[PDB]
Amino acid sequence: SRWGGFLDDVAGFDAEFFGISEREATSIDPQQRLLLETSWEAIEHAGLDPASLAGSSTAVFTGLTHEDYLVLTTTAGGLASPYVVTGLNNSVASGRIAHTLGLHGPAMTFDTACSSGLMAVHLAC
Amino acid sequence: MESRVTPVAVIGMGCRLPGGINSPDKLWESLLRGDDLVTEIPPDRWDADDYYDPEPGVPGRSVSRWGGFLDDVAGFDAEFFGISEREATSIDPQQRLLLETSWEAIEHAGLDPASLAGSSTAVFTGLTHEDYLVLTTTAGGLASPYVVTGLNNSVASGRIAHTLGLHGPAMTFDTACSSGLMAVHLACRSLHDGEADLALAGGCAVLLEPHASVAASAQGMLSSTGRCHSFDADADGFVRSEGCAMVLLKRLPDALRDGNRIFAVVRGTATNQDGRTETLTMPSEDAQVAVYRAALAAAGVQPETVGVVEAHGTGTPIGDPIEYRSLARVYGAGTPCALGSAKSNMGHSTASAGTVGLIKAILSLRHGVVPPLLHFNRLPDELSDVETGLFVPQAVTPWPNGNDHTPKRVAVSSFGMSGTNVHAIVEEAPAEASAPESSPGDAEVGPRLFMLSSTSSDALRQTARQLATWVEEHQDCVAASDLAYTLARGRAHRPVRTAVVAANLPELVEGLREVADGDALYDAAVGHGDRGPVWVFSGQGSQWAAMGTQLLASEPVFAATIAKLEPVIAAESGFSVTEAITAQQTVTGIDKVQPAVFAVQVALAATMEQTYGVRPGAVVGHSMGESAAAVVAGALSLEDAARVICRRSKLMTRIAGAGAMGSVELPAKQVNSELMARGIDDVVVSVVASPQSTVIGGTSDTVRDLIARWEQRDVMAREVAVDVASHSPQVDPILDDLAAALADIAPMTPKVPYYSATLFDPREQPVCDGAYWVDNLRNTVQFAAAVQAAMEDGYRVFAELSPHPLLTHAVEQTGRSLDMSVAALAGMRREQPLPHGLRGLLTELHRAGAALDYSALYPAGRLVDAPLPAWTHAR
Ligand SMILES: *[C@@H](CCCCCCCCCCCCCC)C(=O)NCCNC(=O)CCNC(=O)[C@H](O)C(C)(C)COP(*)(=O)O
């Protein structure tokens, strides 16, 4: 294959708005950045102030896979970066969102190949 | 109701942990002994000295050089799970450990893993690190296509489900180092929702590459000492350690209804997130208090009732005081409460921490005692003023606040870097649902058949060795009958298998020790346990002096059947058969021998049917044994068959065959071509045994000259020493009288599928009337056709009922000619004693792989904690 659907920008991420240092922002998984940004966008699309949800029992679930950024950093050999601990571990995918929004409901990330996109909805239900 | 969630009972667990711990009992023993499992990083993993540096925060270097590691992580049995070696190489060792531990846990519950096919059962597991991905990438060898399913995290639960054919939610998730307890909560909810009925929870943590450790050290997360100071004033941080464990869960009412062993019961659990704090890894005391209260409310259990809390206890100087502060808010309310953490003796597992804590709590409940906390001597100064009844047991300490009227209860807790927190409440399992003390009675003093199985011969030897060790350690703490019941019915049977027969535990210990070092080339079972064996009612020729003496002196059913048949023999055949059975000289004479073998074989079949209950998948009869075969086949009555055998024994004696028997190894068609080349039709083929073994009947002179000619033809041909001929135009004078006198029989439809060897098509069920017996004494018998039909029909297991094997090699050749593997056994060997009886022969039936009812041998018995078979561990 030579083709596919690809984002307009992948490395793009508004780390400053969420109070994120450029170092961790450089080392954080772009998938995590996309999830966080689109989650904020969905929250706003609901008409709710994201700041309003702080200190509430709302929960978060997300499906993640294809940790290709691990391959990239391994090839680059920059695994020694301390931000990798929270920049590449799949756990923080939900945890980063929960901490940013200050939510108290359970935060969990999982992987079910190409079925996470709806199994997350089932789990939330 | 009082618990909003349906209470869930743990019915089994499995674990593979550092320091050679591969069983929960081993973990319990290590914990009681106060042993440590943290060691220096093994060199084969990587050079610890290369990456070690005591200076904090040095880039590219770690602060620790220790860790808890397994005996081996590369060990795995691809053959048992049917995995290609090429594929097995690309598999993440985490997946292999998950699969093996899950299989161990299922067997630890006494359930057959194969029995769960298509069952509505779910599985949940947590994966945290992808060290194998790092290794594959740095090796540049991930171009192998088998890496896709071998590295993707979601495959793990899917792989387990596909191996076991489970039909229920399969989950691979992560909650940092709290995945296990999160999986437990998910399984509990799913069972409450009714989506599944059986769920598996757990997580595996594998340490293979150093860069992750270096990154962790860069964050200051690792202890420089090399040991976790959980709650100690010297808290230096956690230590990375290998780990993998699984737990099986079933709904409590269902478990009670099925009477399965209930290790403990979990009343409820809950989960929440800390939320906004200083960083992504700052714990929130209020959040932990909230999750404690929520879990208690879900379980509907008061906190002061719980005695011991399984805290996280990671050893971080920042985290541990916070965790201690939170617990004092809820637990330790005046009533003393003990504190325990599994990390003190094992270290920290980034995925299995919750599961190992849960298992330690389970064992603590099982023994009503708490192990001491390793390396601990005093709390940090920040906790000096905190008021609570909480305490850390410096030694092995009985259950705090012991109360007969209340079940013992344990709280567990796990926390991850992601900030999500899981807490659960574990309650002591109810009293024994079965009869108290398993209703002891007149336990049989006769030797018990202790089954055994494994994946390979050397693995079988190692399994026998460790099992003997364990039995020696508990020769008095357990009972032989319960152990035998557990082995027979509460354990899956691996393809490589054997058995030891013993009456007392020291005897079993000696027998197991014999094979533990004794060499023997064991082979895996050929049968699949789906069909019963096939009896071989072999004919005359293998008799010897006093065959039945041991059987009469040891098998009550055998003696009863012999005494039952004896008067009918003296009536119809005119002489007693017991005297010939006990005769010190080998029985001779077609009148005398013929009923003797019939009685022997029918008595043996009755013994197998009653004292051992093994049903035949099919039945094969040889010569006069064909009537004896029809006896157990359900086609002939016992009296009718006795009349048949006695009357034919009397009648054949009139002329004594009037001929001779010639056996030649030449193929049957080639034999027919050779015979027709000389016009020697006065002889005719009598037995079709194998494509490389035929028997020809005829007059003595022509048989003798034919076998002389074949010897001149450089082909083996023997005139056997039989006194009479069969299936030859020489017994003709008796045929008319035999048909006339024997027409009184009343055959019926066989109860067991039977192969008519005499008939052209053994697959067709014969009428086995007097005409059939005339053919059986005059027409050729196609034993080769019968065995070929049996193999074609899928049957693989065959056992001779003869006093001595006669055609085991022949049927082996038939299978070898067909090229399909088979197992041929002999009921008894020439002058072979057996004080144990046919029980020893029964072991060979199991070793072959035939189906049978084990409850027929083990109607009841309490399951026990006998160890598990080892594994082939090719790296
Ligand atoms: C268990 C989690 C610890 C083990 C997880 C290892 C992560 C390695 C990631 C590897 C990815 C890339 C691989 C290939 C390069 C656990 O219990 N977590 C909680 C430990 N306790 C916590 O509550 C806090 C732990 N650390 C701390 O106490 C603080 O976060 C510190 C002070 C270390 C961080 O500094 P600051 O944020 O306060």
PDB file of all heavy atoms in Angstrom, chain A residues 65 74 82 91 95-96 99-100 102-107 109-111 113, chain B residues 137 154 172 174-176 219 271-273 275-277 279-280 418 420:
ATOM      1  N   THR A  65      -3.897   2.025  20.779  1.00  0.00           N
ATOM      2  CA  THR A  65      -3.091   0.946  20.217  1.00  0.00           C
ATOM      3  C   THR A  65      -2.059   1.567  19.285  1.00  0.00           C
ATOM      4  O   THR A  65      -1.974   2.791  19.149  1.00  0.00           O
ATOM      5  CB  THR A  65      -3.951  -0.074  19.476  1.00  0.00           C
ATOM      6  OG1 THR A  65      -3.105  -1.071  18.891  1.00  0.00           O
ATOM      7  CG2 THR A  65      -4.745   0.606  18.385  1.00  0.00           C
ATOM      8  N   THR A  74      12.652   4.628  20.132  1.00  0.00           N
ATOM      9  CA  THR A  74      13.667   3.585  20.214  1.00  0.00           C
ATOM     10  C   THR A  74      14.668   3.715  19.074  1.00  0.00           C
ATOM     11  O   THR A  74      15.881   3.593  19.278  1.00  0.00           O
ATOM     12  CB  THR A  74      13.007   2.210  20.198  1.00  0.00           C
ATOM     13  OG1 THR A  74      12.221   2.050  21.386  1.00  0.00           O
ATOM     14  CG2 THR A  74      14.059   1.118  20.145  1.00  0.00           C
ATOM     15  N   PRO A  82      13.398  11.452  30.822  1.00  0.00           N
ATOM     16  CA  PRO A  82      12.538  11.084  31.956  1.00  0.00           C
ATOM     17  C   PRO A  82      11.062  11.295  31.687  1.00  0.00           C
ATOM     18  O   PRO A  82      10.226  10.645  32.325  1.00  0.00           O
ATOM     19  CB  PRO A  82      13.042  11.994  33.082  1.00  0.00           C
ATOM     20  CG  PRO A  82      13.636  13.160  32.375  1.00  0.00           C
ATOM     21  CD  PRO A  82      14.249  12.613  31.124  1.00  0.00           C
ATOM     22  N   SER A  91      -0.983   4.227  30.131  1.00  0.00           N
ATOM     23  CA  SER A  91      -1.886   4.473  31.248  1.00  0.00           C
ATOM     24  C   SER A  91      -2.310   5.932  31.307  1.00  0.00           C
ATOM     25  O   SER A  91      -3.485   6.241  31.534  1.00  0.00           O
ATOM     26  CB  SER A  91      -1.220   4.076  32.560  1.00  0.00           C
ATOM     27  OG  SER A  91      -2.203   3.779  33.533  1.00  0.00           O
ATOM     28  N   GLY A  95      -5.396   9.064  32.292  1.00  0.00           N
ATOM     29  CA  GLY A  95      -4.993   9.772  33.494  1.00  0.00           C
ATOM     30  C   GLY A  95      -4.663  11.228  33.243  1.00  0.00           C
ATOM     31  O   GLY A  95      -4.993  12.097  34.052  1.00  0.00           O
ATOM     32  N   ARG A  96      -3.994  11.516  32.126  1.00  0.00           N
ATOM     33  CA  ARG A  96      -3.674  12.902  31.811  1.00  0.00           C
ATOM     34  C   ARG A  96      -4.941  13.723  31.627  1.00  0.00           C
ATOM     35  O   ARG A  96      -5.040  14.846  32.134  1.00  0.00           O
ATOM     36  CB  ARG A  96      -2.801  12.968  30.560  1.00  0.00           C
ATOM     37  CG  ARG A  96      -2.270  14.342  30.229  1.00  0.00           C
ATOM     38  CD  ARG A  96      -1.418  14.284  28.979  1.00  0.00           C
ATOM     39  NE  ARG A  96      -0.310  13.351  29.135  1.00  0.00           N
ATOM     40  CZ  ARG A  96       0.813  13.625  29.786  1.00  0.00           C
ATOM     41  NH1 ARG A  96       1.020  14.808  30.340  1.00  0.00           N
ATOM     42  NH2 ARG A  96       1.752  12.688  29.883  1.00  0.00           N
ATOM     43  N   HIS A  99      -6.584  14.281  35.056  1.00  0.00           N
ATOM     44  CA  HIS A  99      -5.876  15.266  35.863  1.00  0.00           C
ATOM     45  C   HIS A  99      -6.060  16.670  35.310  1.00  0.00           C
ATOM     46  O   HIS A  99      -6.204  17.632  36.073  1.00  0.00           O
ATOM     47  CB  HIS A  99      -4.394  14.918  35.937  1.00  0.00           C
ATOM     48  CG  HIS A  99      -3.591  15.887  36.744  1.00  0.00           C
ATOM     49  ND1 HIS A  99      -3.026  17.019  36.200  1.00  0.00           N
ATOM     50  CD2 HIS A  99      -3.269  15.898  38.058  1.00  0.00           C
ATOM     51  CE1 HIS A  99      -2.381  17.683  37.144  1.00  0.00           C
ATOM     52  NE2 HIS A  99      -2.513  17.023  38.281  1.00  0.00           N
ATOM     53  N   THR A 100      -6.047  16.811  33.984  1.00  0.00           N
ATOM     54  CA  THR A 100      -6.227  18.124  33.382  1.00  0.00           C
ATOM     55  C   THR A 100      -7.611  18.677  33.674  1.00  0.00           C
ATOM     56  O   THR A 100      -7.764  19.863  33.986  1.00  0.00           O
ATOM     57  CB  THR A 100      -5.994  18.045  31.877  1.00  0.00           C
ATOM     58  OG1 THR A 100      -4.767  17.353  31.622  1.00  0.00           O
ATOM     59  CG2 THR A 100      -5.915  19.438  31.283  1.00  0.00           C
ATOM     60  N   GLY A 102      -9.540  17.510  36.123  1.00  0.00           N
ATOM     61  CA  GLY A 102      -9.842  17.358  37.538  1.00  0.00           C
ATOM     62  C   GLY A 102     -11.053  16.499  37.823  1.00  0.00           C
ATOM     63  O   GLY A 102     -11.869  16.846  38.686  1.00  0.00           O
ATOM     64  N   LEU A 103     -11.192  15.384  37.118  1.00  0.00           N
ATOM     65  CA  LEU A 103     -12.343  14.507  37.263  1.00  0.00           C
ATOM     66  C   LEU A 103     -12.045  13.411  38.275  1.00  0.00           C
ATOM     67  O   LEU A 103     -10.889  13.064  38.519  1.00  0.00           O
ATOM     68  CB  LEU A 103     -12.724  13.890  35.919  1.00  0.00           C
ATOM     69  CG  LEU A 103     -12.611  14.858  34.742  1.00  0.00           C
ATOM     70  CD1 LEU A 103     -12.982  14.172  33.441  1.00  0.00           C
ATOM     71  CD2 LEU A 103     -13.474  16.090  34.972  1.00  0.00           C
ATOM     72  N   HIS A 104     -13.106  12.860  38.861  1.00  0.00           N
ATOM     73  CA  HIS A 104     -12.955  11.861  39.906  1.00  0.00           C
ATOM     74  C   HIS A 104     -13.490  10.487  39.545  1.00  0.00           C
ATOM     75  O   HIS A 104     -13.156   9.521  40.237  1.00  0.00           O
ATOM     76  CB  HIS A 104     -13.634  12.336  41.198  1.00  0.00           C
ATOM     77  CG  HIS A 104     -12.929  13.481  41.852  1.00  0.00           C
ATOM     78  ND1 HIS A 104     -13.041  14.777  41.398  1.00  0.00           N
ATOM     79  CD2 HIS A 104     -12.088  13.523  42.911  1.00  0.00           C
ATOM     80  CE1 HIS A 104     -12.307  15.570  42.158  1.00  0.00           C
ATOM     81  NE2 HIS A 104     -11.719  14.834  43.083  1.00  0.00           N
ATOM     82  N   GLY A 105     -14.290  10.364  38.492  1.00  0.00           N
ATOM     83  CA  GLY A 105     -14.743   9.070  38.046  1.00  0.00           C
ATOM     84  C   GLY A 105     -13.581   8.241  37.545  1.00  0.00           C
ATOM     85  O   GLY A 105     -12.509   8.766  37.232  1.00  0.00           O
ATOM     86  N   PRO A 106     -13.765   6.924  37.473  1.00  0.00           N
ATOM     87  CA  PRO A 106     -12.658   6.050  37.076  1.00  0.00           C
ATOM     88  C   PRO A 106     -12.138   6.398  35.692  1.00  0.00           C
ATOM     89  O   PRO A 106     -12.906   6.682  34.770  1.00  0.00           O
ATOM     90  CB  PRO A 106     -13.283   4.652  37.102  1.00  0.00           C
ATOM     91  CG  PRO A 106     -14.472   4.780  37.983  1.00  0.00           C
ATOM     92  CD  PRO A 106     -14.988   6.166  37.770  1.00  0.00           C
ATOM     93  N   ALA A 107     -10.819   6.370  35.553  1.00  0.00           N
ATOM     94  CA  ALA A 107     -10.150   6.627  34.287  1.00  0.00           C
ATOM     95  C   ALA A 107      -9.416   5.363  33.879  1.00  0.00           C
ATOM     96  O   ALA A 107      -8.585   4.854  34.637  1.00  0.00           O
ATOM     97  CB  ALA A 107      -9.181   7.804  34.400  1.00  0.00           C
ATOM     98  N   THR A 109      -7.806   3.057  30.315  1.00  0.00           N
ATOM     99  CA  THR A 109      -7.474   2.924  28.908  1.00  0.00           C
ATOM    100  C   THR A 109      -7.284   1.450  28.589  1.00  0.00           C
ATOM    101  O   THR A 109      -6.788   0.681  29.414  1.00  0.00           O
ATOM    102  CB  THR A 109      -6.211   3.700  28.549  1.00  0.00           C
ATOM    103  OG1 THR A 109      -5.802   3.356  27.221  1.00  0.00           O
ATOM    104  CG2 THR A 109      -5.096   3.370  29.523  1.00  0.00           C
ATOM    105  N   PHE A 110      -7.688   1.061  27.388  1.00  0.00           N
ATOM    106  CA  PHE A 110      -7.694  -0.347  27.025  1.00  0.00           C
ATOM    107  C   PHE A 110      -7.350  -0.478  25.549  1.00  0.00           C
ATOM    108  O   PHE A 110      -7.081   0.510  24.862  1.00  0.00           O
ATOM    109  CB  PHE A 110      -9.045  -0.985  27.336  1.00  0.00           C
ATOM    110  CG  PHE A 110     -10.171  -0.408  26.552  1.00  0.00           C
ATOM    111  CD1 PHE A 110     -10.556  -0.975  25.354  1.00  0.00           C
ATOM    112  CD2 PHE A 110     -10.842   0.709  27.006  1.00  0.00           C
ATOM    113  CE1 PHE A 110     -11.592  -0.445  24.627  1.00  0.00           C
ATOM    114  CE2 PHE A 110     -11.881   1.244  26.282  1.00  0.00           C
ATOM    115  CZ  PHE A 110     -12.254   0.665  25.089  1.00  0.00           C
ATOM    116  N   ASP A 111      -7.364  -1.718  25.069  1.00  0.00           N
ATOM    117  CA  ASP A 111      -7.079  -2.020  23.676  1.00  0.00           C
ATOM    118  C   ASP A 111      -7.833  -3.277  23.281  1.00  0.00           C
ATOM    119  O   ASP A 111      -7.652  -4.330  23.897  1.00  0.00           O
ATOM    120  CB  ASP A 111      -5.577  -2.214  23.450  1.00  0.00           C
ATOM    121  CG  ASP A 111      -5.212  -2.310  21.982  1.00  0.00           C
ATOM    122  OD1 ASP A 111      -6.126  -2.363  21.131  1.00  0.00           O
ATOM    123  OD2 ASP A 111      -4.002  -2.342  21.679  1.00  0.00           O
ATOM    124  N   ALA A 113      -8.066  -4.019  19.666  1.00  0.00           N
ATOM    125  CA  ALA A 113      -7.782  -3.959  18.227  1.00  0.00           C
ATOM    126  C   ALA A 113      -8.668  -2.864  17.637  1.00  0.00           C
ATOM    127  O   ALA A 113      -8.630  -1.726  18.127  1.00  0.00           O
ATOM    128  CB  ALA A 113      -7.944  -5.344  17.615  1.00  0.00           C
TER     129      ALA A 113
ATOM    130  N   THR B 137      12.311  -3.847  18.044  1.00  0.00           N
ATOM    131  CA  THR B 137      12.668  -2.659  17.279  1.00  0.00           C
ATOM    132  C   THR B 137      14.176  -2.460  17.239  1.00  0.00           C
ATOM    133  O   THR B 137      14.752  -2.209  16.176  1.00  0.00           O
ATOM    134  CB  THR B 137      11.983  -1.433  17.873  1.00  0.00           C
ATOM    135  OG1 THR B 137      12.201  -1.410  19.289  1.00  0.00           O
ATOM    136  CG2 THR B 137      10.493  -1.475  17.596  1.00  0.00           C
ATOM    137  N   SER B 154      -3.860  -6.138  22.365  1.00  0.00           N
ATOM    138  CA  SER B 154      -5.227  -6.645  22.439  1.00  0.00           C
ATOM    139  C   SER B 154      -5.295  -8.146  22.202  1.00  0.00           C
ATOM    140  O   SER B 154      -6.289  -8.784  22.565  1.00  0.00           O
ATOM    141  CB  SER B 154      -6.113  -5.917  21.431  1.00  0.00           C
ATOM    142  OG  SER B 154      -5.978  -6.480  20.139  1.00  0.00           O
ATOM    143  N   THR B 172      -7.880  -6.463  27.110  1.00  0.00           N
ATOM    144  CA  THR B 172      -6.512  -6.111  27.459  1.00  0.00           C
ATOM    145  C   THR B 172      -6.482  -4.611  27.675  1.00  0.00           C
ATOM    146  O   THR B 172      -6.664  -3.842  26.726  1.00  0.00           O
ATOM    147  CB  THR B 172      -5.522  -6.511  26.367  1.00  0.00           C
ATOM    148  OG1 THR B 172      -5.567  -5.542  25.316  1.00  0.00           O
ATOM    149  CG2 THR B 172      -5.874  -7.876  25.808  1.00  0.00           C
ATOM    150  N   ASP B 174      -5.030  -1.220  30.571  1.00  0.00           N
ATOM    151  CA  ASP B 174      -3.980  -0.841  31.498  1.00  0.00           C
ATOM    152  C   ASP B 174      -4.492   0.246  32.425  1.00  0.00           C
ATOM    153  O   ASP B 174      -5.234   1.135  32.004  1.00  0.00           O
ATOM    154  CB  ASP B 174      -2.728  -0.350  30.775  1.00  0.00           C
ATOM    155  CG  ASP B 174      -1.653   0.091  31.737  1.00  0.00           C
ATOM    156  OD1 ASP B 174      -1.792   1.174  32.330  1.00  0.00           O
ATOM    157  OD2 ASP B 174      -0.676  -0.655  31.922  1.00  0.00           O
ATOM    158  N   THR B 175      -4.080   0.164  33.683  1.00  0.00           N
ATOM    159  CA  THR B 175      -4.328   1.206  34.665  1.00  0.00           C
ATOM    160  C   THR B 175      -3.045   1.473  35.438  1.00  0.00           C
ATOM    161  O   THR B 175      -3.031   1.507  36.672  1.00  0.00           O
ATOM    162  CB  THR B 175      -5.476   0.824  35.597  1.00  0.00           C
ATOM    163  OG1 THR B 175      -6.562   0.319  34.812  1.00  0.00           O
ATOM    164  CG2 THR B 175      -5.983   2.047  36.335  1.00  0.00           C
ATOM    165  N   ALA B 176      -1.943   1.636  34.703  1.00  0.00           N
ATOM    166  CA  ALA B 176      -0.606   1.689  35.282  1.00  0.00           C
ATOM    167  C   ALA B 176      -0.397   0.486  36.184  1.00  0.00           C
ATOM    168  O   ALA B 176      -0.836  -0.621  35.861  1.00  0.00           O
ATOM    169  CB  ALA B 176      -0.388   2.991  36.055  1.00  0.00           C
ATOM    170  N   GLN B 219      13.453   9.881  36.951  1.00  0.00           N
ATOM    171  CA  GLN B 219      12.378  10.497  37.714  1.00  0.00           C
ATOM    172  C   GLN B 219      12.558  10.332  39.215  1.00  0.00           C
ATOM    173  O   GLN B 219      11.734  10.844  39.979  1.00  0.00           O
ATOM    174  CB  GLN B 219      11.034   9.906  37.292  1.00  0.00           C
ATOM    175  CG  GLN B 219      10.647  10.214  35.859  1.00  0.00           C
ATOM    176  CD  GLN B 219      10.142  11.630  35.684  1.00  0.00           C
ATOM    177  OE1 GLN B 219      10.046  12.391  36.646  1.00  0.00           O
ATOM    178  NE2 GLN B 219       9.813  11.990  34.450  1.00  0.00           N
ATOM    179  N   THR B 271     -13.972   2.120  42.329  1.00  0.00           N
ATOM    180  CA  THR B 271     -12.861   2.732  41.616  1.00  0.00           C
ATOM    181  C   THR B 271     -13.169   4.206  41.398  1.00  0.00           C
ATOM    182  O   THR B 271     -14.322   4.591  41.192  1.00  0.00           O
ATOM    183  CB  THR B 271     -12.614   2.029  40.277  1.00  0.00           C
ATOM    184  OG1 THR B 271     -12.361   0.639  40.509  1.00  0.00           O
ATOM    185  CG2 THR B 271     -11.425   2.630  39.559  1.00  0.00           C
ATOM    186  N   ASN B 272     -12.129   5.030  41.451  1.00  0.00           N
ATOM    187  CA  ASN B 272     -12.269   6.460  41.201  1.00  0.00           C
ATOM    188  C   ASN B 272     -10.908   7.011  40.797  1.00  0.00           C
ATOM    189  O   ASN B 272      -9.906   6.292  40.773  1.00  0.00           O
ATOM    190  CB  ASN B 272     -12.831   7.191  42.420  1.00  0.00           C
ATOM    191  CG  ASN B 272     -11.903   7.134  43.612  1.00  0.00           C
ATOM    192  OD1 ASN B 272     -10.876   6.458  43.588  1.00  0.00           O
ATOM    193  ND2 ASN B 272     -12.260   7.852  44.669  1.00  0.00           N
ATOM    194  N   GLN B 273     -10.881   8.303  40.489  1.00  0.00           N
ATOM    195  CA  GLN B 273      -9.673   9.001  40.079  1.00  0.00           C
ATOM    196  C   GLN B 273      -9.378  10.139  41.044  1.00  0.00           C
ATOM    197  O   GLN B 273     -10.298  10.799  41.536  1.00  0.00           O
ATOM    198  CB  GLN B 273      -9.816   9.549  38.659  1.00  0.00           C
ATOM    199  CG  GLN B 273      -8.666  10.427  38.218  1.00  0.00           C
ATOM    200  CD  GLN B 273      -7.385   9.651  38.034  1.00  0.00           C
ATOM    201  OE1 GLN B 273      -7.407   8.468  37.703  1.00  0.00           O
ATOM    202  NE2 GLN B 273      -6.257  10.311  38.255  1.00  0.00           N
ATOM    203  N   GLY B 275      -7.890  13.007  40.304  1.00  0.00           N
ATOM    204  CA  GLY B 275      -8.270  14.244  39.654  1.00  0.00           C
ATOM    205  C   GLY B 275      -7.153  15.263  39.589  1.00  0.00           C
ATOM    206  O   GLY B 275      -5.985  14.909  39.405  1.00  0.00           O
ATOM    207  N   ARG B 276      -7.504  16.536  39.738  1.00  0.00           N
ATOM    208  CA  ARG B 276      -6.519  17.603  39.667  1.00  0.00           C
ATOM    209  C   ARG B 276      -5.659  17.617  40.920  1.00  0.00           C
ATOM    210  O   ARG B 276      -6.175  17.632  42.042  1.00  0.00           O
ATOM    211  CB  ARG B 276      -7.205  18.955  39.489  1.00  0.00           C
ATOM    212  CG  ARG B 276      -6.240  20.125  39.471  1.00  0.00           C
ATOM    213  CD  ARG B 276      -5.261  20.007  38.319  1.00  0.00           C
ATOM    214  NE  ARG B 276      -5.919  20.183  37.031  1.00  0.00           N
ATOM    215  CZ  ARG B 276      -6.210  21.362  36.499  1.00  0.00           C
ATOM    216  NH1 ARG B 276      -5.912  22.491  37.118  1.00  0.00           N
ATOM    217  NH2 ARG B 276      -6.812  21.408  35.315  1.00  0.00           N
ATOM    218  N   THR B 277      -4.347  17.610  40.725  1.00  0.00           N
ATOM    219  CA  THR B 277      -3.389  17.763  41.811  1.00  0.00           C
ATOM    220  C   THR B 277      -2.145  18.425  41.234  1.00  0.00           C
ATOM    221  O   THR B 277      -2.181  19.006  40.144  1.00  0.00           O
ATOM    222  CB  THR B 277      -3.077  16.420  42.474  1.00  0.00           C
ATOM    223  OG1 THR B 277      -1.912  16.555  43.296  1.00  0.00           O
ATOM    224  CG2 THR B 277      -2.828  15.356  41.425  1.00  0.00           C
ATOM    225  N   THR B 279       0.870  17.161  40.125  1.00  0.00           N
ATOM    226  CA  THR B 279       1.392  16.544  38.915  1.00  0.00           C
ATOM    227  C   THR B 279       0.471  15.407  38.508  1.00  0.00           C
ATOM    228  O   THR B 279      -0.596  15.204  39.089  1.00  0.00           O
ATOM    229  CB  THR B 279       2.815  16.010  39.108  1.00  0.00           C
ATOM    230  OG1 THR B 279       2.754  14.687  39.654  1.00  0.00           O
ATOM    231  CG2 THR B 279       3.613  16.902  40.046  1.00  0.00           C
ATOM    232  N   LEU B 280       0.906  14.652  37.503  1.00  0.00           N
ATOM    233  CA  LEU B 280       0.195  13.453  37.086  1.00  0.00           C
ATOM    234  C   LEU B 280       0.436  12.282  38.014  1.00  0.00           C
ATOM    235  O   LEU B 280      -0.208  11.240  37.859  1.00  0.00           O
ATOM    236  CB  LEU B 280       0.591  13.066  35.660  1.00  0.00           C
ATOM    237  CG  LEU B 280       0.340  14.087  34.554  1.00  0.00           C
ATOM    238  CD1 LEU B 280       0.248  13.380  33.219  1.00  0.00           C
ATOM    239  CD2 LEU B 280      -0.923  14.874  34.824  1.00  0.00           C
ATOM    240  N   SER B 418      -1.157   6.564  36.768  1.00  0.00           N
ATOM    241  CA  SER B 418      -2.197   7.311  36.073  1.00  0.00           C
ATOM    242  C   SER B 418      -3.121   8.024  37.050  1.00  0.00           C
ATOM    243  O   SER B 418      -3.848   8.944  36.660  1.00  0.00           O
ATOM    244  CB  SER B 418      -2.998   6.372  35.173  1.00  0.00           C
ATOM    245  OG  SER B 418      -3.522   7.061  34.053  1.00  0.00           O
ATOM    246  N   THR B 420      -5.615   6.552  38.862  1.00  0.00           N
ATOM    247  CA  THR B 420      -6.811   5.775  39.148  1.00  0.00           C
ATOM    248  C   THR B 420      -6.541   4.849  40.325  1.00  0.00           C
ATOM    249  O   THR B 420      -5.457   4.266  40.427  1.00  0.00           O
ATOM    250  CB  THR B 420      -7.232   4.981  37.916  1.00  0.00           C
ATOM    251  OG1 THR B 420      -7.287   5.854  36.782  1.00  0.00           O
ATOM    252  CG2 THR B 420      -8.594   4.361  38.126  1.00  0.00           C
TER     253      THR B 420
END
